[PDB]
């Protein structure tokens, strides 16, 4: 119904952006996260979303693992950017 | 003239209705627009205030925008950056 976060308004961190996480390469999710904040803050969203250990899933960013600890800013994420999640049950 | 004191900004609501607002230069326009939202009933999030030809940010300031006490804040509802 509602949609916040600067629709493509990534300037200089501390200006929250929407983060898209693609899980199991079957669909996508759109998270809203600033940047300077570790991605591990985001990596659990998907979980609370799909029911994932958070630590068990595997995320990625345009050419980066973004090992949660990685903050979007540090890596240079953007609004609506995506972070692919690939984690089997094995 | 004006360094870090107040300055009046004219915010236009796309419909041709602009408003005057004194906002201290080094102050985030988020206040001036907050008054605009106050003036009517906008959301301030669904709104994007553009400065005389210059996308605006809640944190953007007249100084930061080289405005003055005789400039104009342009208003646009959702379209600019954040």
């Amino acid at each position: 119904g509602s949609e916040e976060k600067p629709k493509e308004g990534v300037k200089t961190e501390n200006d929250h952006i929407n983060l898209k996480v693609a899980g199991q390469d079957g669909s996508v999710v759109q998270f809203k996260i600033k940047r300077h904040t570790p991605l591990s803050k985001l990596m659990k969203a998907y979980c609370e979303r799909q029911g994932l250990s958070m630590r068990q899933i595997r995320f990625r960013f345009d050419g980066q693992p973004i090992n949660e600890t990685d903050t979007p800013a540090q890596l240079e994420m953007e609004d609506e950017d995506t972070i692919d999640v690939f984690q089997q049950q094995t | 003239g004006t360094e870090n004191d107040h300055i009046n900004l004219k915010v236009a609501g796309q419909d041709g209705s602009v408003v005057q607002f004194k906002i201290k230069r080094h102050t985030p326009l988020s206040k001036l627009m907050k008054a605009y939202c106050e003036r009517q009933g906008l959301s301030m999030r669904q709104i994007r205030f553009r400065f005389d030809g210059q996308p605006i940010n809640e944190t953007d300031t007249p100084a930061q925008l080289e405005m003055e006490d005789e400039d104009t804040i342009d208003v646009f509802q959702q379209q600019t950056g954040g």
Partner: peptide, 25 residues
């Protein structure tokens, strides 16, 4: 997606100098 997004990040904005409001409109 359909649904909010929890995460809670650092601050959002900073105000160096203060100021009041006005009427008009």
């Amino acid at each position: 997606t359909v649904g909010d997004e929890i995460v809670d990040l650092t601050c959002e904005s900073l105000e160096p100098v203060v100021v009041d409001l006005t009427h008009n409109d």
